[PDB]
Every structure is written in C-alpha cells, then in structure tokens.
C-alpha cells in the first residue's frame, strides 16, 4: 500500500522555569523511528526502531545537529508568536509542526506537507501544490508574507519532492522485515447484556499492523452505520494495534447482526456472527 | 532524515 515519513515537533514555553521544552519524533508509516528530548540527558537524536541503527555516526551527528537547530528556531517562534497576538509572558503556549511526504504502492511520490500550529489550532500550512500557503488568521498573514519573501516554499519543494522520499524508500527497504510487514487481526466477539431488553455485541480486532483498519457492523446485510460505537485505534504496546466496534441489539435479534473486518494483512474480508 | 533549513515564523 502507501507509505509515508512524518516528523512531529512540539515546543512548549515555560513562563519562568527554564527554556521551552522541545520534543521531536520521526515516523515511517505507523512506526516511530527517532526521538529527541530537550530534557533528556542525551542531547542527541535517539534510535527508536531496530532498522536505522545501521546508519553511521555521521548520520546521528547530523540529525542531532539539525534537530537542535529546530529547537532554536522554535524557541524564537514562541516569542515572535506572542508578539503577533500580543500575549503576556505569563502563560505558556504551544507551538507544533508536522512535515513529511507520502508515496504510492509503487513508492512514487504523491503528496507533501508542512503544517504549523499555535496553541492547538492551525496557523499556517503549505497547499498541496507545494508553492503557496494558507494562513488561518491575520497573525499568519505575517508569517506567510515573510515566507514567500524568503522563498521558503521553493526551498521545501526540494526536500519534500526528493530528499524526504529518497530517505523514505531507503528506510522502507532497510526495514522490510518490520515495515513491509502486514499482521492480520486476531479477531473475536463479545456479548454482554446491557439493558434489560438488549445486549451489546462488540467486535474485536487485535495485534494487527498497519493501524489502517475497517470494522463494520451489519444487520440483515444492510450495514447499520449509525448505532455503531467505534473506539479510536489504540496501540497494544508491542508495535501492533487494537480496535473494536459495538452495537446494542434487542436481545434475540443477535443472529441477525454481522461484523465485518477489513485489513491489508487479511487475504479476504472477515465477517463474524455471535 | 530531518529537514536542514527551517525559517522562523
């Protein structure tokens, strides 16, 4: 299927108790591979997935060096942003950034991203054409104005459109055994009498990878979409994920319902019945 | 691999 490399950055200011905190994490598909933490004693980019460890020191020194340059830029963005919204220095604020790329089933380039947020809300983002920006509010008009002045987008193009995907393909083939992997969901079902005139049916999918999955309940073949409780796909802690979907049905009518499980590692869509 | 040049907002 598709693949992608993402880099997430978080910076939080601390009113008056040290520098702001910086946290950077890198992913390939649904697998974290690097991380940096201002408060960790390392002060270096750390490996977080088995492949990648084959990368030489020059690589580590580099990413470590680059990611600190990222922390400075953000250290500053925190101050400039207050200024744009003319905010006090008293309360902490948060700055987030997420850039990366996507590749098709054939590893060919598809999309590029470079988004930014302040206090959990969009601030500015690169349009799909990788040439123009979208400013959420008047403060971002300023960031946008100086970005098109400093030909930022033109400079990113190079990265997203190339460097980013080159590295992705690289990590994709060095990590075959982990990344190219597909784990079908260990599946099963639950039944607990909810109310006095009905019983909940919960369809389980466990230890699967990648996280992309589709759990679908049906009644008499027609999928009863509304009335289906879905939990947010959550990690198992071991590199795989778990998820469920449930429906509360009038007791006795349980034979009529059906759960359907779609997943890449699955050769043909499952359908379960109580 | 991270991006090398990042512009201040």
């Amino acid at each position, epitope marked *: 299927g598709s693949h992608s490399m993402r880099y997430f950055f978080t910076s939080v200011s601390r009113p008056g108790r040290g520098e702001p905190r910086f946290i950077a994490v890198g992913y390939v598909d649904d697998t974290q591979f690097v991380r940096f933490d201002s408060d960790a004693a390392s002060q270096r980019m750390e490996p977080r997935a088995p492949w990648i460890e084959q990368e030489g020191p020059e690589y580590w020194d580099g990413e470590t060096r680059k990611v600190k340059a990222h922390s400075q*830029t953000h*250290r500053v963005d925190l101050g400039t942003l207050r200024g744009y919204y003319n905010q006090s220095e008293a309360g902490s604020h948060t700055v987030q950034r997420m850039y990366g790329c996507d590749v098709g089933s054939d590893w060919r380039f598809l999309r590029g991203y470079h988004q930014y947020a302040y206090d959990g809300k969009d601030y500015i983002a690169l349009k799909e054409d990788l040439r123009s920006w979208t400013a959420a509010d008047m403060a971002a008009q300023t960031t946008k104005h100086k970005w098109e002045a400093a030909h930022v987008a033109e*400079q990113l193009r*190079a990265y997203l459109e190339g460097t980013c995907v080159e590295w992705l393909r690289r990590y994709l083939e060095n990590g075959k055994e982990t990344l190219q992997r597909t784990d079908a969901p260990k599946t099963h079902m639950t039944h607990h009498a909810v109310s006095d005139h009905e019983a909940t049916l919960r369809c389980w999918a466990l230890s699967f990878y990648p996280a992309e999955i589709t759990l679908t309940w049906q009644r008499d073949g027609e999928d009863q979409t509304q009335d289906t409780e879905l939990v947010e796909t959550r990690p198992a802690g071991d590199g795989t994920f778990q998820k469920w979907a449930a429906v509360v049905v009038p007791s006795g009518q349980e034979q009529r319902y059906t759960c359907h499980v779609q997943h890449e590692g699955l050769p043909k869509p499952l359908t379960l019945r109580w | 691999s991270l991006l090398m040049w990042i*512009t201040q907002c």
Partner: T-cell receptor
Amino acid sequence: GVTQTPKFQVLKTGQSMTLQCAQDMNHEYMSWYRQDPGMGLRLIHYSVGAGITDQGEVPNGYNVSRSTTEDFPLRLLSAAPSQTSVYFCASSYVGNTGELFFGEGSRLTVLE
Amino acid sequence: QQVTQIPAALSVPEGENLVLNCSFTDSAIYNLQWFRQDPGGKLTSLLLIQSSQREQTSGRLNASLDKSAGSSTLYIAASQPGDSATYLCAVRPTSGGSYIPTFGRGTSLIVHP
C-alpha cells in the same frame, strides 16, 4: 547587527582573553573565524543554538559557549604568538535567506 | 565542495564593465553569497542568491546563479577605482547538517584610475 569587541588587542603569551560577539537578529547560527594576512577564513567554532557548540577547522587554544541566543563569546585559554591574527564573528539564520553577517573584526597580537 | 574563482587576479581601467567568476563542485547548495574585502578592512556582503533564484542586483552590482552547472558570475557596471578589492563567493550546503559555508580564495580586482 553583529558587533565584536574589542577591535584591537595586544596580549603577552599566557593571558586569557575573551572576544565577545553579539547579534540582535535572533540568528540561531553564530561562527568564529581567524584570517591570517591574506590567507583565507579558517573556521574555529560554530553553533546552531543555545546550549550547543561544535568544532571547526582550528579549535585549538579556543573555547566557546552559547548560553544565550545573542552572545557567542570566544575565549583563548592561554595566549600564544601563533594565535596573533584577525578574528571574525559571523551569524545567520539557520533558514530564511541564510545570509551571513560578519562582525567588524578583531585584531589580536600576542607578544612574548 | 570546492569553490574556484579564476582569473585569480583582475586588472582593468575605470569605466569598463567587468566579470568575476565563481565555480563550485557540489550543486546541492542553499545559497551563494558575494563579499568584498579590502586589506585591513572587514568583509562586506554584496549580494545573496538563494538556490531557488537567478539574477540578483544592487546598484552597479549584478550577479547570476547557474546552480545546475555549478557557476556564478558577478557583474560590475562602470568600474570605479573604489571597486578595487578582493571579491569572494561562498556557498552553503543544501544538506549535510552543518550549515558551515565554503569560501573560495577570491579574485584580486584592481580598477586603475
């Protein structure tokens, strides 16, 4: 801009000297060079952020620190005649244009 | 990787438009910047061309960037004796993670009155 002090200085071998450098352009990158008479810039140290520093081409006899964004002081622990030279502090954003901004320069002369 | 500037020396009479060459081995660069330095004096930035751009201008100075063929040229209109100095072009890498620039040894310009 980038302001260096002092511009001229004379030292006897063995003295510890600190060349200051500061900028108010919020540049993340600051660097130190020494250029001997018509030789070419030779990188001593550079830093991309508060708290970090990295060696260059000739870091010997030179220590450096980056406690803040604005200041990047270069210190010669123990002065030597070989260090008699013209020092240049230079800064830039670590993005944007990536334009270098050189300081005025500092002439040191170490005499025994 | 390697920045070359030849002719290494250049002598002309004032009034003549001139050219200063600059060549680099690694095209993967974020920018190219022209400086000016006079014996005893400092370095003065002249122009700054981003890797995405070409013809940048300032006063009688004008310069192109052909990053594909690792080349840059500095132009100077009506040469003034005050132009006499050493001109340098330096570059900075598109990646590699050090932001450390690379200078050429510059060309010696003497504009005779």
